[PDB]
């Protein structure tokens, strides 16, 4: 998993840091979006590898972000989810995954390993 470029998408900068960190010291690299848009921008500006995309963002919803992301490219995803709208999220599989909020941060890494391994 190394080299391994994530965009992760939180407006909670604190759980965007722990997430960032855990994953950085599994030796993947962590590009931060606050927001639906910066998603796009950053998706479409760097190399990104997997997606972890909070649902609960701030104007956007994560469901619409995914699928303008989508149209342009098959780039993973793991959805952080509090688990309405569990339809889509069991869709997810699907070759992606979702983490229920609260998580432990460790089954992020092993999720997005499991993901990255499998695509
Ligand atoms: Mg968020």
Redesign the pocket.
């Known amino acids: 998993c190394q080299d391994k470029v994530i965009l992760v ?4 900068y604190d ?1 965007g840091d722990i997430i960032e960190n855990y994953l950085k010291r599994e030796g993947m690299s962590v590009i931060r979006a606050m927001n639906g848009k910066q998603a796009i921008e950053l998706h479409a500006s760097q190399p990104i590898d997997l997606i972890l995309l ?5 104007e956007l919803n994560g469901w619409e972000v995914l699928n303008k992301i989508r149209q342009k490219a098959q780039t993973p995803v793991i959805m ?1 989810t509090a688990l309405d709208i569990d339809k889509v999220m069991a869709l997810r599989i699907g070759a992606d995954d979702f983490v229920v909020k609260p998580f432990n941060p460790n089954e992020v890494i092993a999720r997005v390993q499991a993901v990255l391994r499998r695509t």
């Not at 998408?9 to 909670?12: G, M, R, S, T």
């Not at 909070?54 to 701030?58: E, M, T, V």
């Open positions: 998408v939180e407006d909670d759980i909070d649902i609960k963002l701030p952080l």
